[PDB]
Coordinates of C-alpha atoms in Angstrom, one line a residue:
Chain A
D107 CA 64.4 -23.4 18.9
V108 CA 60.9 -25.1 19.5
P109 CA 61.1 -28.5 21.2
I110 CA 58.4 -31.1 20.5
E111 CA 57.2 -31.1 24.1
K112 CA 56.0 -27.5 23.8
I113 CA 53.5 -28.3 21.1
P114 CA 50.6 -29.6 23.3
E115 CA 50.9 -26.4 25.4
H116 CA 50.1 -24.4 22.2
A117 CA 47.4 -26.9 21.4
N118 CA 45.8 -26.3 24.8
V119 CA 46.0 -22.6 24.3
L120 CA 44.2 -22.7 21.0
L121 CA 41.7 -25.2 22.4
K122 CA 40.8 -22.7 25.2
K123 CA 40.4 -20.0 22.5
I124 CA 38.2 -22.0 20.2
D125 CA 36.1 -23.2 23.1
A126 CA 35.6 -19.6 24.3
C127 CA 34.4 -19.0 20.7
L128 CA 32.1 -22.0 20.4
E129 CA 30.4 -21.5 23.8
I130 CA 29.2 -18.1 22.4
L131 CA 28.5 -19.3 18.8
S132 CA 26.6 -22.3 20.2
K133 CA 24.0 -19.8 21.2
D134 CA 21.5 -18.6 18.6
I135 CA 18.6 -16.2 18.5
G136 CA 15.1 -17.8 18.4
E137 CA 12.0 -16.6 16.7
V138 CA 10.7 -13.2 17.8
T139 CA 7.6 -13.2 20.0
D140 CA 6.9 -9.4 20.3
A141 CA 3.3 -8.8 19.4
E142 CA 4.1 -5.4 18.0
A143 CA 6.2 -7.3 15.4
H144 CA 3.3 -9.6 14.5
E145 CA 0.3 -7.3 15.0
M146 CA -0.2 -7.1 11.2
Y147 CA -0.5 -10.9 10.9
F148 CA -3.8 -10.4 12.8
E149 CA -4.7 -7.1 11.3
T150 CA -4.7 -8.8 7.9
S151 CA -7.0 -11.7 8.9
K152 CA -10.0 -12.4 6.7
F153 CA -12.3 -11.4 9.6
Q154 CA -12.2 -8.5 12.0
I155 CA -10.7 -9.2 15.5
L156 CA -13.2 -10.0 18.2
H157 CA -12.2 -8.3 21.5
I158 CA -14.0 -10.9 23.7
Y159 CA -14.1 -10.3 27.5
Chain B
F61 CA -18.0 -8.0 -3.7
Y62 CA -17.4 -9.3 -0.2
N63 CA -13.9 -10.4 -1.1
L64 CA -13.0 -7.0 -2.7
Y65 CA -14.3 -5.0 0.3
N66 CA -12.7 -7.4 2.7
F67 CA -9.4 -6.4 1.0
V68 CA -10.4 -2.8 1.0
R69 CA -10.7 -3.2 4.8
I70 CA -7.0 -4.2 5.0
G71 CA -5.7 -1.2 3.0
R72 CA -4.4 1.9 4.8
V73 CA -4.4 4.8 2.4
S74 CA -6.4 3.8 -0.7
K75 CA -9.6 3.1 1.3
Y76 CA -9.6 6.7 2.5
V77 CA -8.5 8.4 -0.7
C78 CA -9.8 6.6 -3.8
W79 CA -13.3 7.6 -2.9
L80 CA -12.5 11.3 -3.3
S81 CA -12.7 11.1 -7.1
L82 CA -16.3 9.8 -6.8
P83 CA -18.1 13.1 -6.1
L84 CA -16.8 14.1 -9.6
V85 CA -19.1 11.5 -11.1
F86 CA -22.1 13.1 -9.6
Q87 CA -20.8 16.5 -10.7
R88 CA -20.9 15.2 -14.3
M89 CA -24.3 13.6 -13.7
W90 CA -25.7 17.0 -12.6
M91 CA -23.9 19.2 -15.2
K92 CA -24.9 16.9 -18.1
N93 CA -28.6 17.3 -17.2
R94 CA -28.0 21.1 -16.8
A95 CA -26.6 21.1 -20.3
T96 CA -29.2 18.9 -22.0
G97 CA -31.7 21.8 -22.0
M98 CA -29.6 25.0 -21.5
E99 CA -31.0 28.0 -23.3
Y100 CA -28.4 29.8 -25.5
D101 CA -28.2 32.7 -27.9
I102 CA -28.8 31.8 -31.5
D103 CA -26.4 34.5 -32.7
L104 CA -23.4 33.3 -30.6
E105 CA -24.1 29.6 -31.6
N106 CA -24.1 30.6 -35.3
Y107 CA -21.1 32.9 -34.9
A108 CA -19.1 30.7 -32.4
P109 CA -20.3 27.1 -32.6
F110 CA -18.2 24.9 -30.3
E111 CA -16.2 22.2 -32.2
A112 CA -18.3 22.6 -35.3
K113 CA -16.8 21.6 -38.7
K114 CA -15.7 23.9 -41.5
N115 CA -15.0 26.8 -39.2
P116 CA -12.2 28.7 -41.0
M117 CA -11.1 30.4 -37.8
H118 CA -10.1 26.9 -36.6
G119 CA -8.3 26.1 -39.8
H120 CA -10.7 23.9 -41.7

């Protein structure tokens, strides 16, 4: 009950699905840059912080 | 000493707490000198000597 001409339609459907998946999964989260997350990297320096203005 | 105190600088709780046991050192320094020459009753020292040996009330 499934002719062989109907296969590439199914393949196209699944290609659309997996492409919709990979366009999201291709994205990734980079390194965090919030200073509040890294303030203790500077708090723990071997010298006190110079607020120079 | 600079290394140790540069690390004390980085602490959060110990650098404000671990010094509170230090006055106790001076307490001992003062009380020891108070006790080196404290005048006491001869009768109580002969009747109740502190941690002296051969006191039967202690057991030995």
